[PDB]
Symmetry: D2
Subunit: 242 residues, 4 copies
């Protein structure tokens, strides 16, 4: 009786989810796991990679926790070479991660997205199928410098994603992004209460978003039903736009 | 567990302009996700076609006649639905010359507003709702057609954003879907040279299928899209204009 | 010298004070003959006085852009007494549901006035239509909804009309101000003023003259390849 | 008012087309103008062009990709001509996979030059930075991708830098041209030219001087409350 929904299944796909040790990234690893995919979650530290592997086992999800530093050509090549040998090619990839800091931050994020994306693309090109999904940063940054950073990264993410989607379309690989708003995370929990209350007041739905609410959007994008969606940045912010 | 977030079991959905193409594909998708579905058309023959189509696909619901330009037709059709089927908590609005753009947008948005306002009582009572507006398909011939398309798209997106702000506190979401070059009876009328030129501008290298719109709509209608509101989701294979 | 509006006639609606006034004077000073308008006869007197006092040939008239009759009438008067206006500048606690009627009314007004002045511009094969958006300041969430809706509608409207009239060398542009020093923004309570200022990188309110200078440029021959554009003048505060 | 009397302006990539038209416009508005090029011959051409138009200034060699060339060229300008408080960044087979490197390079170059001229502008508590985007380069899909990526990057960058430097009364804006007369557009056969013109509501290509006038206005005191903006100068053809 629930059988129509088997077409949203990711049975037989392998998915790589960076920064999967907590919050949004973790909720995504579990959602893709639950949809049937084999899931490799990653972290910068060995302890995070352990936490991921534990978390996956505990939720009945085949896969692994690995260490990955997207700023390193070496770590990227190595991690992918490992995944292909032990688990399969990842055809679903989810990238999750002062006044003057904005430029270096955007420059670093996008050089990282490009490095990882380019590496997983050889596999997706051979398969003539792929899903690349870039997760933007959460709203909350304190003060003007934080607004500048957030807005810059969001503009860069959206133009990048659009462009890469044009570059890889003919190979039936989609490239999309998700732009969260005020989501309940460790980072937003550390905002002082006055600023949390002020952000809520600007959200039409009147609540913070849940990590799972980002993950579901990601899960849909990864499905065969989202196949004509590419180059898009989907905002998940309860109606609060900048 | 994965489908508790996808199911529309026990929801009622109203889908305008459901007699063919995109609207039809959406009626069927919401049906298949478990909703009771009322599809509508401007003519009695279209309303028959809808009801036939629904029965043939194993979907409980109805085909009705609805003219979104008429306060009377709207009030009447809703009354009928509440009495016979339940309150529609999912509503999907689907439905030249140089100077026609302004009237076209004005008419589209007045129609969206009229229908949306009427279904909002029901949603407010339930503290739950999904409104979803479907934008036009790419294909329009010449410069006047481009002006019309680009205006309607900008209007749809601003409108959707504003209504979403207005109704958010009641856990009703309002989103839109902006299709690109989709295979419809209208795009099939395009001569081959123009189809080929449009394809050439689409990174995926193909026209979109009506079902491909409908899946996006099905997702927006789900509980998993609950924090998505005010958004216009483009479904265009990477061709942005 | 090069940015002169010598020999052009300009119509500037809502010109009796603030932004509209500053624009009337700026175009006047650039050499144009200027007709400023107001909803009231007293405003129209004030405009005509203000123009004389600054050495600007033109007139103050009464105009209600919501009325087909007031529009047709005011234009008929201007053509008969002063020339065809080839530069036209449209200037002119809320509840959660008011946005739609407000936008609908603003844009129906822009369309009405724009369509009417277009016959003149078409004859001349030259024109400048310039739409001024509303000033930032609106109180609460309903006001933000309204401001954002009007701004989106202004931009799309301006783009579309620009496509329609381009072949006749008429440009259509808009100016989207931010937090400008006006009578209306002066009456905002201090907490809201302080909060807005804190969000402006330049760290100050904008002056009416600063909007007017942008408008003056758009009206010039040097802005001839600028059309369909909405130019933001907000000290770096975007939303 | 509109005069740039007493200002010094640095204009990169000034040896021809848009950059040249801007050098001359700022010159004619009264500024002292330093135009720059990657080559010594271009720098000669600039200096010749300035003298011929009655504009005090100089032609220098500048490679915006080099920290050394940047530091050196600024040093030279400060010593001989004054601090440049108006800065206009213009500078510079097509494949669908080139967009990233192009944007990464343009923006690293803007950042490098902008950061260097900011000390001067901070000390003066006045400045104008103006970034010129790329005209459309090629009619393919790849030409669209590149064009749209550069433009998106330029806009976000300009917006961010404007937020960073606003308190010091420095404005940062960009100008996004559409189609100007180029070798590429000159070679379009009549049918394709008509179709390109047909996508431009004004029905013509834009002149370098038309970009330059916009720049001149942005540089003036009248544009003081305009910052973070990208002003499109494309005859009504919008593309992204
Ligand atoms: O007329 C338009 C051309 C381009 C883009 C938007 C509009 C437009 N927009 C309208 N509404 C609108 C536009 C943007 C945000 C919100 C709203 Cl309601 C509108 C409402 C009533 C009558 C005419 C209207 N026209
Ligand atoms: O690669 C891109 C494609 C489309 C739009 C923007 C980018 C992009 N954008 C970048 N930066 C950027 C984008 C928007 C706002 C601010 C910045 Cl820095 C960027 C910075 C360093 C290196 C590469 C970058 N690429």
């Amino acid at each position: 009786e629930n059988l129509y929904f088997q077409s949203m299944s990711l049975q037989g796909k392998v998915a790589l989810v960076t920064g999967a040790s907590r919050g949004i990234g973790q909720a995504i690893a579990l959602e893709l796991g639950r949809l049937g995919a084999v899931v490799i979650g990653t972290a910068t530290s060995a302890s995070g990679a352990e936490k991921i592997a534990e978390t996956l086992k505990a939720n009945g999800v085949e896969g692994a926790g690995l260490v990955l530093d997207v700023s390193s050509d070496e770590s990227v090549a190595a991690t992918l070479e490992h995944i292909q040998q032990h688990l399969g090619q990842p055809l679903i990839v989810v990238n999750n991660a002062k006044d003057d800091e904005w430029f270096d931050v955007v420059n670093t994020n996008l050089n990282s997205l490009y490095r990882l994306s380019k590496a997983v693309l050889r596999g997706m090109t051979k398969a003539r199928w792929g899903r690349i999904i870039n997760i933007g940063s959460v709203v909350g940054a304190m003060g003007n410098a934080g607004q500048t950073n957030y807005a810059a990264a969001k503009a860069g993410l959206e133009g990048f994603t659009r462009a890469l989607a044009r570059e890889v379309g003919s190979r039936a690989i989609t490239v999309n992004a998700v732009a969260p708003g005020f989501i309940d995370t460790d980072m937003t929990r550390e905002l002082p209460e006055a600023q949390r209350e002020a952000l809520l007041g600007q959200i039409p739905l009147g609540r913070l978003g849940q990590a799972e609410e980002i993950a579901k959007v990601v899960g849909f994008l990864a499905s065969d039903g989202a196949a004509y969606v590419t180059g898009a940045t989907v905002p998940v912010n309860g109606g609060m736009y900048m």
